[PDB]
Enzyme design. Structure first.
Site, PDB file in Angstrom:
ATOM      1  CB  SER A 134      -0.987   0.011   1.152  1.00 52.18           C
ATOM      2  OG  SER A 134      -2.081  -0.863   0.920  1.00 52.18           O
ATOM      3  CE1 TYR A 137      -1.012   1.154  -6.783  1.00 49.31           C
ATOM      4  CE2 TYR A 137      -0.509  -0.246  -4.917  1.00 49.31           C
ATOM      5  CZ  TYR A 137      -0.828  -0.111  -6.251  1.00 49.31           C
ATOM      6  OH  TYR A 137      -0.924  -1.252  -7.005  1.00 49.31           O
ATOM      7  CD  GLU A 218      -4.288  -7.053  -5.788  1.00 53.94           C
ATOM      8  OE1 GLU A 218      -3.076  -6.681  -5.772  1.00 53.94           O
ATOM      9  OE2 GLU A 218      -5.061  -6.821  -6.723  1.00 53.94           O
TER      10      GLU A 218
HETATM   11  N1  LIG Z   1      -4.068   1.658  -3.035  1.00 47.23           N
HETATM   12  C1  LIG Z   1      -3.678   0.572  -2.355  1.00 47.23           C
HETATM   13  O1  LIG Z   1      -3.295   0.632  -1.177  1.00 47.23           O
HETATM   14  C2  LIG Z   1      -3.714  -0.757  -3.054  1.00 47.23           C
HETATM   15  C3  LIG Z   1      -3.555  -1.905  -2.272  1.00 47.23           C
HETATM   16  C4  LIG Z   1      -3.494  -3.164  -2.864  1.00 47.23           C
HETATM   17  C5  LIG Z   1      -3.580  -3.300  -4.244  1.00 47.23           C
HETATM   18  C6  LIG Z   1      -3.756  -2.171  -5.032  1.00 47.23           C
HETATM   19  C7  LIG Z   1      -4.000  -1.988  -6.474  1.00 47.23           C
HETATM   20  O2  LIG Z   1      -3.990  -2.844  -7.403  1.00 47.23           O
HETATM   21  C8  LIG Z   1      -4.248  -0.553  -6.613  1.00 47.23           C
HETATM   22  C9  LIG Z   1      -4.601   0.081  -7.730  1.00 47.23           C
HETATM   23  C10 LIG Z   1      -4.590   1.492  -8.068  1.00 47.23           C
HETATM   24  C11 LIG Z   1      -4.247   2.546  -7.222  1.00 47.23           C
HETATM   25  C12 LIG Z   1      -4.273   3.854  -7.670  1.00 47.23           C
HETATM   26  C13 LIG Z   1      -4.643   4.156  -8.982  1.00 47.23           C
HETATM   27  C14 LIG Z   1      -4.679   5.565  -9.391  1.00 47.23           C
HETATM   28  N2  LIG Z   1      -5.033   6.007 -10.601  1.00 47.23           N
HETATM   29  N3  LIG Z   1      -4.988   7.355 -10.604  1.00 47.23           N
HETATM   30  N4  LIG Z   1      -4.614   7.706  -9.417  1.00 47.23           N
HETATM   31  N5  LIG Z   1      -4.408   6.617  -8.634  1.00 47.23           N
HETATM   32  C15 LIG Z   1      -4.970   3.083  -9.804  1.00 47.23           C
HETATM   33  F1  LIG Z   1      -5.336   3.321 -11.085  1.00 47.23           F
HETATM   34  C16 LIG Z   1      -4.951   1.778  -9.385  1.00 47.23           C
HETATM   35  O3  LIG Z   1      -4.141   0.057  -5.376  1.00 47.23           O
HETATM   36  C17 LIG Z   1      -3.849  -0.914  -4.436  1.00 47.23           C
END
Ligand SMILES: NC(=O)c1cccc2c(O)c(Cc3ccc(-c4nnn[nH]4)c(F)c3)oc12
Length: 240
Positions: A134, A137, A218
């Site tokens: 996480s 990100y 996930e």
């Molecule tokens: N966010 C997490 O903690 C998390 C935890 C476990 C797995 C995933 C996973 O596959 C995503 C996917 C994701 C996150 C952000 C964007 C994005 N786009 N524009 N701005 N942000 C996106 F397109 C996809 O996030 C995850």
């Protein structure tokens, strides 16, 4: 002058880049500093320490502040799910610039016009049980090393467990969520209970799952009401 505690003042400054207390009110969220000496803080620090993945070795994490959060309306919105089995405390990372929206509106599903790239189980709300998965990100850097991460209580119920990307049209009968199975898992023997919610803060071990596309688990829900955001951490990323 603000009447908020200094750590909250500093959080608001970070989130918004109007007076501090006016910006606070826009978040429609009660924000409380968690005592460093508390049971809650000890659990959360252990979760951070134990679930940093061996392959995310560009940095280590230092917890600066832990906040407990209660969004306006959350009590009523979550009530139908608060009695579902298998409620777990899970990570969600995001860029700092997204947090004013996340706190005011809650976590939302990406709209139809956004790309599905990056979402192996289609558009939903995604969580990890490994802090670094996480934390990645947050998109921090040496030049910009402070990030924000969430802990949510997620009402997973019966999980639809998958190993390869699949943009599912509907959950199967009796299923409430998707879990992607990774090669590595927090050791399940080490799960503890915090206020009736399971916390998977075991050190990472081999899951014994073969024939999977994922290094780490996930968790995905497709109904925004299945999420009860509970904690917000301010993290220092120490790049190596
Ligand atoms: N966010 C997490 O903690 C998390 C935890 C476990 C797995 C995933 C996973 O596959 C995503 C996917 C994701 C996150 C952000 C964007 C994005 N786009 N524009 N701005 N942000 C996106 F397109 C996809 O996030 C995850």
């Amino acid at each position: 002058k603000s009447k908020l505690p200094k750590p909250v003042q500093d959080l608001i400054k970070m989130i918004f880049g109007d007076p501090i207390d006016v910006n606070y009110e826009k978040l429609k969220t009660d924000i409380k500093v968690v005592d460093r000496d508390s049971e809650e803080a000890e659990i959360i620090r252990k979760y951070v320490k134990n679930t940093h993945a061996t392959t995310h070795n560009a940095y280590d994490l230092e917890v600066i502040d832990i906040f407990k959060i209660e969004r306006e309306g959350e009590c009523q919105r979550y009530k139908p799910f608060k009695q579902l089995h298998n409620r777990r405390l899970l990570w969600h990372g995001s860029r700092t610039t997204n947090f004013a929206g996340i706190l005011s509106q809650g976590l939302r599903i990406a709209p139809p016009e956004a790309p599905v790239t990056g979402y192996m189980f289609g558009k939903g709300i995604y969580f990890a049980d490994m802090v670094s998965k996480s934390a990645n990100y947050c998109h921090t850097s040496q030049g910009d090393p402070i990030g924000l991460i969430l802990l949510g209580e997620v009402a997973l119920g019966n999980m639809y467990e998958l190993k390869h990307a699949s943009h599912i049209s509907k959950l199967p009968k009796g299923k409430h969520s998707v879990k992607g199975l990774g090669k590595t898992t927090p050791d399940p023997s080490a799960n503890i209970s915090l206020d009736g919610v399971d916390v998977p803060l075991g050190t990472g071990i081999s899951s014994g799952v073969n024939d999977t596309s994922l290094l780490y688990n996930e968790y995905i829900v497709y109904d925004i009401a299945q999420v009860n955001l509970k904690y917000l951490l301010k993290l220092k990323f120490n790049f190596k």
